[PDB]
Amino acid sequence: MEIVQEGIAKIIVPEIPKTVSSDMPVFYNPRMRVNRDLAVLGLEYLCKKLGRPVKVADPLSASGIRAIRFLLETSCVEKAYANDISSKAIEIMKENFKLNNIPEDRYEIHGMEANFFLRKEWGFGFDYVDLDPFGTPVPFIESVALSMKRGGILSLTATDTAPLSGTYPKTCMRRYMARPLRNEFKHEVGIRILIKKVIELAAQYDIAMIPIFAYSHLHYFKLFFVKERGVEKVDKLIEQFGYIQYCFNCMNREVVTDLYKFKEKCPHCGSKFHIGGPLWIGKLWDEEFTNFLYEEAQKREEIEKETKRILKLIKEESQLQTVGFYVLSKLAEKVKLPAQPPIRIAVKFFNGVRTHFVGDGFRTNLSFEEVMKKMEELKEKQKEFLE
Amino acid sequence: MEIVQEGIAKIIVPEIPKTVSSDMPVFYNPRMRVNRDLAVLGLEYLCKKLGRPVKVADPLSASGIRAIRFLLETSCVEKAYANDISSKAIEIMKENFKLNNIPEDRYEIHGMEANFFLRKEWGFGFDYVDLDPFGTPVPFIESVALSMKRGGILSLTATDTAPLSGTYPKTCMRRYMARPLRNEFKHEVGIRILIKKVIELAAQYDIAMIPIFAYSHLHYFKLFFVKERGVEKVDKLIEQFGYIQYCFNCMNREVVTDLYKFKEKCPHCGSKFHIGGPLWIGKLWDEEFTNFLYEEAQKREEIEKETKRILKLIKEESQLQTVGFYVLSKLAEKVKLPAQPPIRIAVKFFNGVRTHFVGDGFRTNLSFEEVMKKMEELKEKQKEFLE
Ligand SMILES: C[S@@+](CC[C@H](N)C(=O)[O-])C[C@H]1O[C@@H](n2cnc3c(N)ncnc32)[C@H](O)[C@@H]1O
Ligand SMILES: C[S@@+](CC[C@H](N)C(=O)[O-])C[C@H]1O[C@@H](n2cnc3c(N)ncnc32)[C@H](O)[C@@H]1O
Ligand SMILES: [Zn+2]
Ligand SMILES: [Zn+2]
């Protein structure tokens, strides 16, 4: 019904409403542009890492845009294996592959259920897999992990952020076996929960799915994993499962990996100290991988400017990684700060960095008490220099 | 190589070593007789419950003994679907089905990978599924749950009892995400961990796998589940996940479902209070289901005498269900009891019942302190009446 261009690719897709949500359940969503940009860059990383032709998988292909962009915008794709259980998805995929002048022997199209497609006896493992489902990726995790080759990378997407973010706690518990926290850094909590789920599902088969990148935007999470083998690597991941105690009254938070160490009352104001998790308390970004994404993105004109700005902010953020973060407006609302300095400036007072999660959010190695102390200080010297 | 008879069935199987373990990794193991007896009785229960023809599945069939015994020893089996990825397993299966004069339209034989076999578009759900793998059943749980029909029953077996029982804690953590306890009731802890794993895997799809029967013998666990639907039923199951704090010094134990309530030191002697779980702290036996198994077993001459004795002991045990149990010899060794009365008699002093888990084990509603008090009393009045 409509032809659109994304990057180097041209595709035929059904017409799209005047406006769409970030997680719009449609055949093709242009608002997922950044997501697909990251996927392309992620594959190019693997290309530079392996230095050889790779086989990539697109189990939930829809229009086939990702597989196509992989073939056109990267250098090492030997063959792309795209799949979709939908018939017209198949038809549209066929026509899109031909529309982009892609040689037949460069790709395969399948109309199987994702898990069947992945668990096929290929005789080889996928170097790169992009899992982009409507809602939760849980039903496909195990099949993906098993189908992937050692050292391979998983490009993952999840749009069921509502349960993960604490809006639907019971739903979150059933699917991810964890208690979410609907706070100012709820999106990070959700991501860390998703990561924990992915790791434990793969851990069942002694497969180590190491998280190397995380990105949250509106109603979708974007994750990157690298598959490794060995029970010791799985163990090292499990050791990085933990809990987050959070206080809704004063926003105090602490990481707990020892079951004996839970506190009922918030040490600061004495309010209820809620428990989030279990979840991933490790690093959200691999410095090298993130840095590559940013540098490689700057070399590509077909990469969205937004993707580049996001990658710059995430690079800055990855150099000071913490569990949870602070939101300036929430802190200021707590201490009634006379004037709120721009977040770029505000972070300096806390020796911290900006976070992509929230506009006025920031990470810092300072303790909660130290942060509040900084707020009071800034508050006092602002009132003091105001006569 | 050898023909053997079990129940009403006659089968051809490769010759078996003079002696075998309970979990012997062989084509056919006669030591699993009791297990298959329970499976048959379990199916007959469903027959009496539904009152209609049912479709049963045997994803890991091997010799095809289970599917055959189902067809021959129950009344409601419409069609049996047996499967095995092994070629000679297939060949042997074919010949065994024909050997027992089973009509072709009464069964189907497949040579697919279990998950593929179960996830096939059958156009119907299985009323009864028997999962009997070498080692852990984890890799098949989700496929089984999805393939089963609402109200259907799962006949499950697990031979990886070593990790579940605490012999290999790190291995247990990777596969079941839980800390085992290598104590006197380690086998119950293992079963409860397995149950928790099964429930959470099915919970991912809003499927409620309710445990209705548990049996531990040597190096294998036997479980029965009934599939139900609705998020509320899944929630009620999740609420029954918990932890077991245990003390290796004095054998004190307590159930903890509240993360805030963990104790570092054993309240009795002050030694380290270890933590087992998370795991299933609910009932291990459905009274009605268990009672049927016992009564129906007594009507069948082709059912092992051992199976009948076990079912009688388990029926007795199911009327006083607790989390964990006590072992007389261990308690006596702690207080140095002059003479140990037979377990049948000993249980009376504690107002408890015998447990199938261990010969001299027993369950009781008395608190740990009360139990030890009983031991000292019995000890004193035994020494007192001894002049
Ligand atoms: C969220 S869309 C992904 C679109 C595409 N990956 C992109 O980036 O634009 C997911 C697609 O997977 C297909 N799908 C959903 N469930 C599936 C399943 N169980 N097996 C195979 N394909 C499935 C649907 O038809 C849907 O079009
Ligand atoms: C433990 S034996 C079960 C024997 C039989 N159920 C009984 O009670 O005597 C498991 C069988 O499943 C088969 N099997 C193992 N892995 C499989 C898989 N991934 N897919 C299909 N069959 C499998 C093996 O060939 C093996 O013979
Ligand atoms: Zn507080
Ligand atoms: Zn103690």
UniProtKB/Swiss-Prot annotation, chains A, B:
UniProt key word RNA-binding: yes
Record EC number: 2.1.1.215
Catalyses which reaction(s): guanosine(26)/guanosine(27) in tRNA + 4 S-adenosyl-L-methionine = N(2)-dimethylguanosine(26)/N(2)-dimethylguanosine(27) in tRNA + 4 S-adenosyl-L-homocysteine + 4 H(+)
Effect on the protein of changing H219A: Strongly decreased tRNA guanine-dimethyltransferase activity
Residues reported in the UniProt entry to bind S-adenosyl-L-methionine: R36, R66, D84, E113, A114
GO molecular function annotations of the record: tRNA (guanine(26)-N2)-dimethyltransferase activity; tRNA (guanine(26)-N2/guanine(27)-N2)-dimethyltransferase activity; tRNA binding; zinc ion binding
GO biological process: tRNA N2-guanine methylation
UniProt keyword terms in alphabetical order: Metal-binding, Methyltransferase, RNA-binding, S-adenosyl-L-methionine, Transferase, tRNA processing, tRNA-binding, Zinc
Protein function: Dimethylates the guanine residues at position 26 and 27 of one or more tRNAs using S-adenosyl-L-methionine as donor of the methyl groups.
Name recorded for this polypeptide: tRNA (guanine(26)-N(2)/guanine(27)-N(2))-dimethyltransferase
Protein's organism: Aquifex aeolicus (strain VF5)
